[PDB]
Amino acid sequence: HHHHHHMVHITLDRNTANSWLIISKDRRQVRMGDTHQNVSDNKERFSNYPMVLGAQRFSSGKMYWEVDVTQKEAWDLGVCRDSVQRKGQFSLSPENGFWTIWLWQDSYEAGTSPQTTLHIQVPPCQIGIFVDYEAGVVSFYNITDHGSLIYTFSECVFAGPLRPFFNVGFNYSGGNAAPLKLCPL
Ligand SMILES: Cc1nnc(N2CCCCC2)s1
């Protein structure tokens, strides 16, 4: 892929974060805390899952960013509609306004409904995410394996502004404490 030149600087929006998340001062890293992080509740916060949005909203153009997933057991990454549901239980699907992939229990899947098995020979330490708004495309790349394609959502119906989407995952196992990090351009 030659999408690197559409690189955008993503920062995390504290106001959308689950109340257990800890975002770094530079707003480029997020991890699950061991308790409530002493913030007030608001209608933006994801209540049921350790999720947060990027501050940036995209309604046109081509955008690229990279996320570090080193030593994590579980995570979700991608984009979502600005108007996705925040409270209660929901599935990650395009019908619900999400275009995502995840790791959980030693397998990688795309967030279609129902979900799709991914075929990854080299476990990624960094993921590239490419959005072509006009084309209706969201693609995921394995930076660790020379930028190899993971998955393409095509014929996407975004139906609104898009926001970068993150889930650091739970840490029931004690093996998933590591952060998600937005990698430098
Ligand atoms: C002013 C505000 N508007 N909505 C708020 N909520 C507090 C958290 C639960 C949902 C209701 S704060």
SS-derived structural category: mainly beta
Q: Please estimate the helix content.
A: under 10%
Strand percentage lies at 35-45%
List the ions, cofactors and other small molecules found in this model. Answer: 1-(5-methyl-1,3,4-thiadiazol-2-yl)piperidine
Biggest sheet details? 7 strands, antiparallel
As for the CATH topology, it is Jelly Rolls
> What CATH architecture do you see?
Sandwich
Tertiary shape: globular
Number of strands: 13
Radius of gyration: 15 Å
- Spatial order of the strands in the main sheet? 1-2-13-4-9-10-11
Distance between the termini: 16 Å
DSSP helix count? 0
Reading off the top of the CATH hierarchy, the class is best stated as Mainly Beta
Q: Element order, helices and strands?
A: EEEEEEEEEEEEE
At the fourth CATH level, what is the homologous superfamily? SPRY domain
The count of domains is 1
PDB class: ligase
Keywords: SGC - Diamond I04-1 fragment screening, trim21
Assembly: monomeric
Entry title: PanDDA analysis group deposition -- Crystal Structure of TRIM21 in complex with Z1251207602
